[PDB]
Amino acid sequence: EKERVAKEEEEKKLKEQQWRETDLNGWIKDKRLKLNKLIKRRKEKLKLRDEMKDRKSQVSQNRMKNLASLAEDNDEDWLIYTDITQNPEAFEEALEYEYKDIVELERLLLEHYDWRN
Amino acid sequence: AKKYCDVTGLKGFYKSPTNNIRYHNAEIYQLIVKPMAPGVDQEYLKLRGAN
Amino acid sequence: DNIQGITKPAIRRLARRGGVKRISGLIYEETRGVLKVFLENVIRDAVTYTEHAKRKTVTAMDVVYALKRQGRTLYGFGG
Amino acid sequence: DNIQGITKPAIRRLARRGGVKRISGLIYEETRGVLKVFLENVIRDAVTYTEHAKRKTVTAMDVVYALKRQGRTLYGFGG
Amino acid sequence: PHRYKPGTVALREIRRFQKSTELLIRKLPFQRLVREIAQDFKTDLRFQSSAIGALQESVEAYLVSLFEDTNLAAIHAKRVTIQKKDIKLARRLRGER
Amino acid sequence: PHRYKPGTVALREIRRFQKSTELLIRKLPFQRLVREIAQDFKTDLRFQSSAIGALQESVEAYLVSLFEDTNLAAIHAKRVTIQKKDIKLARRLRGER
Amino acid sequence: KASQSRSAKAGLTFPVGRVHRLLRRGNYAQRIGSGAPVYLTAVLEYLAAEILELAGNAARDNKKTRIIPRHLQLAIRNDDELNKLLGNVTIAQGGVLPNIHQNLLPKK
Amino acid sequence: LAGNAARDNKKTRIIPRHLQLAIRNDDELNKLLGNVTIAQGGVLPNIHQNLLPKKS
Amino acid sequence: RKETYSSYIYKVLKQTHPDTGISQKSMSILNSFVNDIFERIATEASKLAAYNKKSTISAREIQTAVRLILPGELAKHAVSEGTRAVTKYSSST
DNA sequence: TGCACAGGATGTATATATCTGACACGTGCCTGGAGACTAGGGAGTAATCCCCTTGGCGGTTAAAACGCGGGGGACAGCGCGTACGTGCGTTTAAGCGGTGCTAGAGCTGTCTACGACCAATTGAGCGGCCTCGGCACCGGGATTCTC
DNA sequence: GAGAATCCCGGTGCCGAGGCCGCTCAATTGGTCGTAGACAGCTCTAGCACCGCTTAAACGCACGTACGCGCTGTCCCCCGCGTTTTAACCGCCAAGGGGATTACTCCCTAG
């Protein structure tokens, strides 16, 4: 099972190498678009993480209302109670994984904030 | 008397309502004025004698 | 039947207030034991505040001061 | 690199004071993260006592009073 | 008929008890217990109902906090059912011996 | 070709440090650490010599008091080796969060 | 000649003079300065106002018009600096916040 | 108590390790000072039975 | 004759929530809370004044006690409110 | 034998009508906070002395970093049984609530003797200085777990 | 059965732990007065005791099934040990900056 997955990964790497050797500009554009999408998703996640720290924000009021509704009360309700938990360390791990994915997209683009203002 | 920003010395348009420190624009407020250590606001106000 | 004046589902009620799932049968007398070693430390301090005050009844005041002592303070009855 | 001042055989020395036969390798940085919050929590209440004393040096007199305020009153250096 | 999985209606009972704010110990066995436990230190001792409520609220908070401490020590020990050594560990690591 | 069993000399040096009571923490790196952690609030800080010794004794006592607790958590976990999860449960049961 | 109290001189609704009385014959110090009850009164103002804000939002969150001690308990325990300040005090008739461990759920 | 803890370890001088030995053995004194850290006293030697190796 | 804070805190609630009612037990909890906070702050200030060999309690030792007791952002908001109140009161000229 | 239609039964919908039920506002009152006047002593300023502590030397040396062989300890996995959850029959003694009785909480009055306050006094406990032996340190031989 | 690794007995400065005198404030004694603690005496709230109806909660027996527990095979990651090397520590000299303290003063807080 692991050997078949390794052979599939090697075949995918060979297909990516053949696509880079055949159409380098199209693969570079696709990898740049993927890097831009990953950067936009990471920026949205960072904006959400910054907005969650504010106690007077409307997201904090919505979290308080969700906690009051969960106290007020189903598989969906149990899933919402599981997903309404605080996960700062998991947020940092997800940010690290998103940074690793963005670095992989940047490496795929390579293979295929300023101080003025 | 003319009003100046306490951090940079430029033209101070605004003034924070918490520690009464004048600032120039948003980046100064976000980086310097709001997350400032306690006791430094009085030393800033010591320069123009407003402590 | 005084120390077992509390009943078998009473520890169950205090258990399911605590978010537990499965409960054994040998823990009921042990929870009653920590009841004994908690209420000795509470009402010995309460009766010291009682007969210091030249009274032979406990009021609402000495009990919450006894609770104020060890750091397990309780509101609502402070007046 | 100054945060690398505390050394791993010193953490081993502290561990064998506790009497532990087997130490895994992550315990060192775990105790580092534990201790870093911990000493800063008394540096919090030492330098404000120093500042209210109109002093710019710390001593053995305010640090023992900071520990006595939080709740680990320590003997040996007065107080 | 239709039954329930053991451990699913117990979730409903858990959420019912963690919504409901009511008192979980009957007042007369508790007042008998505190009267016969106050008789040892001093005789002819009368009581107050507000003192009864304060005492019962204190011990109810104490079993509650001790009980999630025991539950956390139990799931720490890769189990679901709690036992007596979980209680002894919770008391020893909480500081009261 | 005399090779000791692993853990026997660990227990022997555990015994030697059980009669021992001296400081197990180097002085100058800890002085550097407390200066770099105290510089962040009001600079140009003078320090007395006895304050560093008091800080040494308090950090060593807190370390050994946490380590006995996590030893009890580990021996309750049916293991000999400690982990981060024992340290978190020790911090949870002692209550410093 | 007639002038009003120091509370509206400082713009506060809590009694400055009563706090001064309690600081005087509370035997904390043999001499009490003038500005101490004003500062202490303002601190109690902000603490009571913030607690009443969280209680009012909790009572709005349950669609009621009265302050139940459940609202006070959930407002104190939900918020984290009020958790650290009020960790060792048990609120009379407060209850317990709902929490289930993730491994205790029917994960399947 | 410190004098007895001095004579059982052959010394005529009081050291803080002897003071720690004198406070920790008496249980009522121990919970009297359950929140007190001593300086240069050490900890009592306790070795766990599961951590003790071999058999008999 | 007995003392309570009830009218003041009632007014504080009417300033922000006009249509909200009150349980008497809630006043008992909140009266105990404000008395307990006044208790810890006042003896922290007295302890600090006894430390500095001073016989006088002023605004600065209770400022340091507020910095000692309260968490950091509550400490900074509390000293902001206290400083603006004491500077408003000190402008009796 | 099954299905469709018709008739009866019942739910309900929304404004009533009585009709309590627990809340927020309009008058006394009394006592304690505020204004005004006096005193004295507690921070406040500041200068000066001296002491310790922050850098900077340098040697040297226990001790940490690093790499390497090996061995039990933690990891998941699988089976055996029983203990806790579920359920219905059968108590029982909690809860309400009602009444009767009386201790004891609580307020007031009055007194006088314990204690703050003040002035004089004498002695004893802090401190600089002086002197010497307990213990750590070092050297070398007996002795005990471990392999 | 051997071997590191201990415990145990004897010589060595030493430097840090007991006396001792000088003496300076701080404990001691006496007198005065004005109030607070103690006791007596008083009025009613509130705590204890018991009877009786209702019934929802609690005990007890029966069984069924997940879950606590016993065993097992295995990576493998911690543990003992040799080899650099790198910073910790001890001896010390000098500065100067910061704490202690004296000394008058006035204002603001007690009454």
Author numbering:
A (entry chain R): 434 to 506, 532 to 570, 584 to 588
B (entry chain S): 112 to 162
C (entry chain B), D (entry chain F): 25 to 103
E (entry chain A), F (entry chain E): 38 to 134
G (entry chain G): 13 to 120
H (entry chain C): 66 to 121
I (entry chain H): 36 to 128
Please share excerpts from the published article on this structure.
However, amongst these remodelers, the INO80 chromatin remodeler appears largely sufficient to generate the well positioned +1 and −1 nucleosomes. S.c INO80 is a multi-subunit complex consisting of 15 subunits that are divided into three different modules. The catalytic module with the Ino80 (ATPase) RecA lobes and insert, Arp5, Ies6, Ies2, Rvb1 and Rvb2, constitutes the core unit of INO80 (C-module). INO80 slides nucleosomes with 40 bp of flanking DNA ~100-fold slower than nucleosomes with 80 bp of flanking DNA, displaying a switch like response to flanking DNA length.
To test whether the reorientation of the Arp8 module was dependent on the species of histones used, we performed biochemical and structural studies of INO80 on nucleosomes containing S.c histones assembled on the 601-nucleosome positioning sequence (S.c nucleosomes) with either 80 or 40 bp of flanking DNA. We found that the remodeling rates of nucleosomes containing all S.c histones were within 2-fold of remodeling rates containing S.c H2A, H2B, H3 and X.l H4. Therefore, for all experiments except those in Fig. S6, we used X.l H4 instead of S.c H4 to make S.c nucleosomes as generating large amounts of X.l H4 is technically feasible. Shortening the flanking DNA from 80 to 40 bp for S.c nucleosomes reduced the remodeling rate of INO80 by ~100-fold. Two distinct classes were identified in this dataset for 0/40 S.c nucleosomes, with the grappler region of Arp5 adopting either a crossed or parallel conformation. These conformations have also been observed for INO80 bound to 0/80 nucleosomes, but the functional consequence of these conformations has not been identified. In comparison, for the INO80: S.c 0/80 (ADP/BeFx) and INO80: X.l 0/80 (ADP/BeFx) datasets, a much smaller proportion of particles fell in classes 1a and 1b. It is further informative that, for the INO80: S.c 0/40 (ADP/BeFx) and INO80: X.l 0/40 (ADP/BeFx) complexes, only a small proportion of particles have either clear or partial density for the Arp8 module on the flanking DNA. Our structures with 0/40 nucleosomes suggest that the Arp8 module sequesters the HSA away from flanking DNA thereby inhibiting its ability to bind flanking DNA.
